[PDB]
């Protein structure tokens, strides 16, 4: 027999997980392979959470772990204690609603999988949308963190293939409320884009700069991610900005079903192999990982199952996701309405209406020429 534990938020989610695992067991042949699941709730103290999760799940000899973000607002502490504790061995952990760029460095987290587009897909879809707008004057504001640097690097490596000059870049630092010199730097330029990569409320600060440097209107479109249009940043924002957001975002039951289906497929694929051991139990008396640890992760990367709730749930080399979906809206007098549908190099935007943060409709052509020349010379009697 085998078991697949998980860490969920509420008891209703636990009941949904039980129903999903029962349905999965009802499927397939279920010959000599039974998977009864166990669940556990969250805790305020991270130390208590880590100790409890190891002593509970590890002692049960699980074969996979599912972790989801708790219902508490903001923050990102959801996977870090579980990922660190279960990262001692090579038991894979599946993410459910955790979209952060810190969990992409395989050197730090050596065993972590999820089915949610990191924020590299944010810059990828940014490049995909910008390839057709025909501006070639990319300038963006980036917060000095892991997410902002990752987004800027993804933009640079997306433009490296196209061989285009991305003007300049602005770095407004994290945790600041007085940013206007960067706005003056971006004031004089032929780059008519105000692409923004900030950290929530920080954007709000530079948003106030938009109300202070009077650059908004008849040009200077804005491009922000899903996290920049939530909270105060959404409230202290001007209309006409493109409300990019990731679409079935706050939905987990469908994601739970997809995860359990792909886990069952991977387990069935792995069962037909050579001798297989079991992960140790106790959290105390074992200091060695089992032999075929990374083998399960490797066979899990190459597991494709495009029949659960949505399209092809394909895992790339990084392990985040492939072929997901994106719904880019716009702040047209608030009430964001989807205008762009994205699924990977195959954008089919909605033709509802296009409005820019200048009260107009026509796309602001981002070009300036200037005939201001700056001759310089040294004196020379017959000529100068």
């Amino acid at each position, epitope marked *: 027999i085998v078991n697949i534990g998980a860490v969920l938020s509420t008891r209703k989610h636990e009941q949904m997980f039980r129903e999903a695992v029962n349905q999965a067991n009802k499927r397939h042949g279920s010959w000599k392979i039974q998977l009864n699941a166990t669940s556990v709730t969250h805790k305020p103290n991270a130390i208590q959470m880590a100790l409890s999760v190891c002593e509970d799940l590890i002692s049960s000899q699980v074969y996979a772990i599912l972790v989801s973000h708790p219902p508490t607002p903001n923050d990102h502490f959801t996977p870090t204690p579980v990922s660190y504790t279960a990262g001692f061995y090579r038991i894979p952990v599946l993410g459910l609603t955790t979209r952060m760029s810190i969990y992409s460095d395989k050197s730090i987290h050596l065993s972590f999988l999820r089915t949610v587009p990191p924020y590299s897909h944010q810059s990828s879809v940014w490049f995909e949308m910008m390839r057709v707008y025909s501006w070639n004057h990319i300038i963006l504001l980036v917060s000095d963190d892991h997410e902002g640097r990752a987004a800027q690097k993804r933009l640079e490596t997306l433009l490296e293939e196209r061989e285009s000059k991305a003007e300049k870049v602005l770095q407004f630092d994290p945790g600041t409320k007085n940013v206007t010199a960067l706005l003056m730097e971006a004031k004089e330029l032929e780059a008519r884009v105000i692409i923004l990569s900030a950290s929530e409320d920080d954007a709000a600060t530079v948003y106030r700069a938009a109300a202070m440097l009077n650059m908004t209107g008849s040009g200077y479109v804005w491009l922000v991610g899903e996290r920049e249009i939530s909270g105060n940043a959404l*409230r202290y924002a001007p209309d006409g900005i493109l409300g990019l957001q990731l679409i079935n975002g706050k939905n987990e039951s469908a994601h739970i079903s997809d995860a359990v289906g792909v886990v069952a497929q991977a387990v069935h694929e792995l069962l037909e192999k050579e001798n297989i051991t079991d992960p140790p139990r106790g959290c105390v008396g074992n200091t060695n990982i089992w032999k075929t640890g990374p083998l399960f992760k490797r066979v899990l990367m190459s597991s494709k199952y495009a029949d659960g709730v949505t399209g092809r749930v394909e895992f790339n080399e990084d392990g985040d996701r492939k072929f997901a979906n994106y719904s880019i809206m716009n702040l047209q007098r608030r009430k964001l309405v989807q205008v762009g549908i994205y699924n990977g190099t195959h954008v089919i935007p909605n033709d*509802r209406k296009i409005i820019w943060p200048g009260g107009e409709t026509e796309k602001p052509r981002g070009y300036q020429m200037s005939t201001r020349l700056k001759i310089v010379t040294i004196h020379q009697e017959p000529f100068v």
Partner: antibody
Amino acid sequence: LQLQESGPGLVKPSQTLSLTCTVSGGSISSSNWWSWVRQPPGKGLEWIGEIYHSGNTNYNPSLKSRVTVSVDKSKNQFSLKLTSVTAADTAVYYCARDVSGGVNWFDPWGQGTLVTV
Amino acid sequence: NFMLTQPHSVSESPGKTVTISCTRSSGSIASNYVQWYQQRPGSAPTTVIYEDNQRPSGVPDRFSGSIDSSSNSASLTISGLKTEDEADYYCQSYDSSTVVFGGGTKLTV
């Protein structure tokens, strides 16, 4: 800019009202919206929809397939149509354009039109 | 979508301070803006408070508005009540889905 709202005057049961809110002293060609405020008798106030010249309009998620608003710039006019208006749709319609500012703000408020279905 | 709650009725002597509280049951009214309108009997409503920090030009300086920021409620304070203040007070707010208006409160002199 002033708004003069005159309705069809017919309030028979199972009918659709289309009030004409003419604009005097102003031009339709602008970046402003024009929203309708629905006031039931002896109750509160709610917003049922709005019109904006350059394209899409958001009436309401509750009655998206029930209220349709169109605008003609040449006549400086804009009309609404409530699809399948029930006998309980007897209220007062007010046409207020907008305030730009940074968020929605209805000012000034027109005299509106009165319908008793 | 959400709802806003207002007191049924209030009574205060003229020349005193009258406080009207409009509470938001769902969510938190701390980032988006709220406004206070006033309706006369038989006339179109007129705004009295916007942006919770100033008043429209020509409005009396007695009217003031503030946000509790603790109980998700907006407080409108009028000092020096007068007979001309007899009207209907409404609280209006907006969100990312729809725009809602308060039930309304009436003060009796």
